[PDB]
Amino acid sequence: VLPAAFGFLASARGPVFATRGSHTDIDTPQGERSLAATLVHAPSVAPDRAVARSLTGAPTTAVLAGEIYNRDELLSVLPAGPAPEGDAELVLRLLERYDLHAFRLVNGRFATVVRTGDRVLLATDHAGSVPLYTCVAPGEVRASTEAKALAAGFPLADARRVAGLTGVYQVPAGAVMDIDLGSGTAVTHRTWTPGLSRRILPEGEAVAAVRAALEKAVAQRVTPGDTPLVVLSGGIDSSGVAACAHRAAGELDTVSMGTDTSNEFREARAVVDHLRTRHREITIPTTELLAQLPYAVWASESVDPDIIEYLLPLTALYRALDGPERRILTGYGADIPLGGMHREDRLPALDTVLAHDMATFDGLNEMSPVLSTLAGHWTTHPYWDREVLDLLVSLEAGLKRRHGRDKWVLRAAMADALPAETVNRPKLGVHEGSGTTSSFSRLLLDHGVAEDRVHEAKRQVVRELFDLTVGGGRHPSEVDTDDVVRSVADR
Numbered sequence: 387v388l389p390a391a392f393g394f395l396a397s398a399r400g401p402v403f404a405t406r407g408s409h410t411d412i413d414t415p416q417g418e419r420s421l422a423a424t425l426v427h428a429p430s431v432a433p434d435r436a437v438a439r440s441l442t443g444a445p446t447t448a449v450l451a452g453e454i455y456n457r458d459e460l461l462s463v464l465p466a467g468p469a470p471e472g473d474a475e476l477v478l479r480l481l482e483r484y485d486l487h488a489f490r491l492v493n494g495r496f497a498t499v500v501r502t503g504d505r506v507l508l509a510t511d512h513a514g515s516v517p518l519y520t521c522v523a524p525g526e527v528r529a530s531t532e533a534k535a536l537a538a539g540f541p542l543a544d545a546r547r548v549a550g551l552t553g554v555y556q557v558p559a560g561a562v563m564d565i566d567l568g569s570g571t572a573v574t575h576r577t578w579t580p581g582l583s584r585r586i587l588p589e590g591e592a593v594a595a596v597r598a599a600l601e602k603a604v605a606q607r608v609t610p611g612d613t614p615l616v617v618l619s620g621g622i623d624s625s626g627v628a629a630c631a632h633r634a635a636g637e638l639d640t641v642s643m644g645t646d647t648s649n650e651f652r653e654a655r656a657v658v659d660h661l662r663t664r665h666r667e668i669t670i671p672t673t674e675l676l677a678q679l680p681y682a683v684w685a686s687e688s689v690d691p692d693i694i695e696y697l698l699p700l701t702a703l704y705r706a707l708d709g710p711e712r713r714i715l716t717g718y719g720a721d722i723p724l725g726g727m728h729r730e731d732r733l734p735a736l737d738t739v740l741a742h743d744m745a746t747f748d749g750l751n752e753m754s755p756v757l758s759t760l761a762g763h764w765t766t767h768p769y770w771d772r773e774v775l776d777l778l779v780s781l782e783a784g785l786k787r788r789h790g791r792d793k794w795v796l797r798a799a800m801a802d803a804l805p806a807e808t809v810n811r812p813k814l815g816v817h818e819g820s821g822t823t824s825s826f827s828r829l830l831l832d833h834g835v836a837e838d839r840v841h842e843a844k845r846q847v848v849r850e851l852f853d854l855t856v857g858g859g860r861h862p863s864e865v866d867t868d869d870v871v872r873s874v875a876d877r
């Protein structure tokens with residue numbers, strides 16, 4: 387049900403993560419010139435499948451956090467028949483055949499570090515959905531799924547430095563960093579890049595392809611026998627995912643979050659009734675929502691005020707979940723390739739914003755698994771599935787904004803599976819349906835923070851939280867959001 391590991395801290399030559407779970411140190415056969423690592427994973431899963439060893443080429447050790455979705459495909463290009471036992475061994479098999487190019491073939495939600503001889507490889511999935519950070523110095527390489535574990539040396543080109551940190555870099559999305567341990571030299575190869583050209587397709591085929599892709603992406607994300615949990619908002623995106631997940635599992639559990647300001651329970655109810663899902667509504671006080679601020683920056687390790695604002699309600703929801711650890715699917719990210727913020731018929735502006743968004747998502751960590759695993763829950767997002775993403779991004783603007791409706795192709799793709807009311811439902815940003823942006827603004831406004839200046843205040847606040855939780859090793863619970871807002875408002 388859950389991946390073999392959520393993250394890790396490794397070194398090639400006392401880990402503390404936001405992620406909740408068991409810790410397991412891997413054995414160090416060649417004790418020495420070996421790959422040491424601490425894996426963080428669910429208490430209910432065996433780390434084994436997240437670790438693979440080999441002698442092909444050299445002594446080799448692979449560690450992988452997360453999971454791969456196009457397994458059948460990758461397996462079809464391998465020689466022998468005895469299939470690898472897990473995703474880490476699968477990667478290993480692929481590396482022995484394509485070398486670092488193996489990552490150009492992977493469609494997944496993972497982060498991995500591999501040591502073969504004195505060579506070290508650091509790879510992320512196409513979207514860098516599972517953040518990966520590193521510190522490289524001649525003779526020593528440290529990699530971790532959380533920068534906070536690395537804050538406790540040389541500069542690396544074609545990698546960005548982490549805010550308020552030194553010698554700590556984030557491996558870019560869709561990339562593989564090839565590091566020679568001896569010289570400490572690092573070379574980065576991109577293994578995926580957003581398509582820039584657009585595809586033309588008749589309505590019927592376009593709508594069918596989108597439906598088929600999403601169904602497949604969702605199917606790849608639901609575990610056989612296990613009923614998944616979908617964070618439902620009543621919007622077309624999460625609703626589209628719910629319909630697909632329900633079909634792949636034959637049943638479905640849903641959940642919706644709301645505040646005392648706002649909610650989308652009504653819109654969500656329409657869908658829970660259409661598919662007859664096991665639904666649950668959660669209402670967290672606005673004051674409780676804002677108190678989540680330090681937890682969001684700590685888990686996401688992001689400094690973008692706008693993203694942190696989008697993550698607040700999600701973070702609160704994951705932490706407020708009751709019951710056993712769940713496999714959660716979301717409809718997050720659908721608006722990006724579809725320009726879900728575009729509100730007119732003039733297509734030009736839609737593509738401009740789309741191209742810009744697709745070129746600047748890396749580093750935001752908005753889809754990081756830590757957002758949910760901080761409470762022991764694993765999340766995956768089918769709309770940013772490589773295949774679904776490639777397709778949605780490639781469609782010509784006229785298929786996204788058509789018939790006076792935004793994200794048209796997606797709405798039409800779920801038409802025969804959801805109520806008409808849900809299909810035509812205008813877009814709403816979870817920030818609007820629960821009043822997160824307004825609440826955060828009101829908080830600053832109630833502290834004296836003037837208007838043409840709340841945004842910058844939100845920046846200073848978020849950045850201050852980061853320096854404390856990520857750079858200073860301070861746990862969110864030990865941080866009082868009000869005190870930080872106070873300090874920032876004084877300016």
Ligand SMILES: Nc1ncnc2c1ncn2[C@@H]1O[C@H](COP(=O)(O)O)[C@@H](O)[C@H]1O
Pocket residue numbers: 616617618619621623624641642643644649650700703715716717718719720721814815816817819820
């Ligand atoms: N009020 C909510 N309760 C539960 N899940 C939500 C809620 N609002 C949004 N989500 C989830 O998070 C994603 C946010 O995307 P968006 O609505 O485009 O901002 C949706 O695709 C849902 O899966």
Ligand SMILES: N=C(N)NCCC[C@@H](C(=O)O)N1CCC1=O
Pocket residue numbers: 696717718719720721722726743746747750752814815816
């Ligand atoms: N430029 C970006 N990377 N924007 C991300 C906004 C997320 C968007 C989504 O679901 O794609 N989203 C959150 C509410 C909403 O809309």
Ligand SMILES: [Mg+2]
Pocket residue numbers: 621623624717718719720721726
């Ligand atoms: Mg959406």
Ligand SMILES: [Mg+2]
Pocket residue numbers: 619621813814815816819
């Ligand atoms: Mg919404």
